[PDB]
């Protein structure tokens, strides 16, 4: 992807975000901070990783933006100058789209492969035990050498 | 081999275990690498004992070491028993089933003779 | 399915939505996305899964469209320049329509085969029970070599 | 790193924070705090280190700036000096953010290797049951001398 | 350290606290207290430590200066000499604080080791072994005389 399909992409995804609350400078820095770690011109299969990354930093950033500032901490406020009165009582609503965002990653790229190996059952595949069996640093129950070493107990995982 | 009962588990708030993860010249590492050696060599002895923090931050405390054990029952079938009925069934085709205690054996001689 | 009538059947299923709240392009950007992910013109199969994802997709733009704007964080209001005063106090409801269309997909379309596979129990089939046992990477109880391997005991899942 | 893109660095991390909230000086304090401790000069691999606990320090400093002052132990306002009349209610705010920071480090460098080593099994690698077994200092199960020394116990762990 | 320095490291430390607030005067105070405990010109060692508690100290005198004063007590406030009406409604926020900071001691410096040695498991290494079994005043089990001494049971946990 190219540096200004991002922004165009970002702000759609994030219900069409203006420029005074997250400016494009600050997109393109969250952007190429996964560039130079994931390669993306070497390997172009990091894609959809990297563009899922930067749009959670930039959520990130949002609430902290939130943050340093006297919206965070208000939740009243009252003008008067006369007849004219106002009074009103996103920090929080931020934190919650996070959490929420982490938990459907397919909105942002459906190829991202999320929630595939929840559950794991060892033992069960030929592949899986034999990568295990085959490994040299491994150490299983059949190495119990005791008092002192034997020669009628392996030393090495693999059979023969 | 697998009957892993009584085995030793130990808790840890992640927050120790995170930092020494990046911060490997940090007292956090030093304590997780003596761990490592210290409960390995946990064995029962003259001087055998663990002290360990009191603290907590929720129902549950943050630092605990309970010795696991099957939760409900164990195996049922007595493989033993199993063999041992094999074994006879085996050695009987042969007349040499009196092992596992004019005869059988002695018939079975004179057949092949 | 043609790109108009995408726009046609999404509003009425979203309740006659206005054009404001929700663009047609933005409706396009979504349809397209599937559109891709699922060659509709090779395998017009996945019309309903395709439709069931755009609409799903919308709704998902339409809670972040009322986050990064005022309406989200505001939960009272008092206006008065004179004799006139007005005090009134939809991200929120947004919110559990969402957790119920992902609950009854029917809505959208009869024929998405929701509800089928809940319970399974294994064994109890033929053609499942001869799957698993053909396959040539299962490894099963009756292959325990033990200290060293002989040749009592099968390598492969499958009878001869 | 230099000292001019420390605060470059720092400001954007922390969403824009201005001069007034956090000096430039107060930056340096804790950054050259870090650079002597982790001689940065002499090994490069500590930036990603000395970065994150440099913006961590300063969250702290920020979270007691609040405190010796008025802001911390006050939640409501009210003046009046005729028809003007204004009412209003970081503290809470930087308190929070801090927990959060200290559990999302990627969010500063992700070359930091955070989450790896949660779970530990020993006697499962050689490479660690060697280590232990070869340690001079090393006191293990098998050198229990009872009532009296006996030349049938070893005294060392390493096997001869 | 000299007594121009602590002064200016322990205002930074504590926000940029102001004069009035804490004076000069009762920072020596605290500061010679820990000098002649600890004897600082006699061993360097001791800078981290001596450091750390004149921090705390402070902190302490800072909660009970709320005390001794009507700010403790008061809770609401309300001034009407006209026109002009003010309500409002440090000594709560400083206690969380000193909890805080008595948990989190690499604020003030890195080189407190703190956090060392949570875990300790006894009969793991013979340096710890040997210094209980050596020591002449230890009794342990090997010395049960039962009903009157016998010369088949040892009087000092030391082997022979």
């Known amino acids: 992807m190219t540096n200004e399909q991002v922004i165009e992409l970002v702000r759609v995804l994030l219900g069409g975000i203006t420029t005074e609350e997250i400016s494009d400078q600050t997109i393109i820095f969250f952007w190429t901070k996964w560039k130079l770690t994931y390669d993306l011109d070497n390997r172009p299969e990091k894609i959809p990783a990297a563009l899922y990354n930067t749009v959670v930093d930039c959520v990130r950033w949002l609430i902290v933006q939130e943050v340093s500032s006297g919206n965070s901490s208000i939740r009243e406020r009252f003008e008067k100058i006369g007849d004219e009165t106002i009074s009103v009582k996103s920090w929080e609503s931020w934190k919650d789209f996070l959490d929420w965002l982490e938990l459907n990653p397919d909105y942002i790229d459906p190829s991202l492969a999320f929630n595939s190996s929840l559950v794991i059952i060892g033992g069960v595949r030929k592949d899986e035990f034999f990568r295990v069996k085959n490994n040299p640093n491994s150490y299983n129950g ?9 020669p009628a107990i392996p030393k090495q995982s693999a059979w023969p | 081999t697998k009957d892993m009962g009584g085995v030793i588990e130990l808790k840890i708030p992640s927050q120790i275990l995170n930092k020494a993860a990046m911060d490997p010249s940090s007292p956090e590492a030093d304590m997780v690498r003596g761990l490592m050696s210290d409960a ?27 010795l696991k054990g099957i939760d409900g029952m164990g195996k049922q079938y007595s493989t033993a028993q199993l063999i041992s009925d094999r074994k ?7 007349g040499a089933g009196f092992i596992n205690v004019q005869t059988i054996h002695t018939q079975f001689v004179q057949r092949v003779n």
Chains 1, 3, 4, 5 share one sequence.
């Open chain 2, 40 to 66: 390995a060599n946990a064995h029962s002895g003259e001087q055998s004992f663990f002290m360990l923090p009191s603290d907590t931050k929720d129902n549950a405390p943050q630092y605990s070491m309970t």
């Open chain 2, 88 to 94: 006879k069934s085996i050695l009987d085709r042969l």
């Open chain 1, 142 to 150: 059949f190495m119990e050498q005791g008092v002192y070493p034997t």
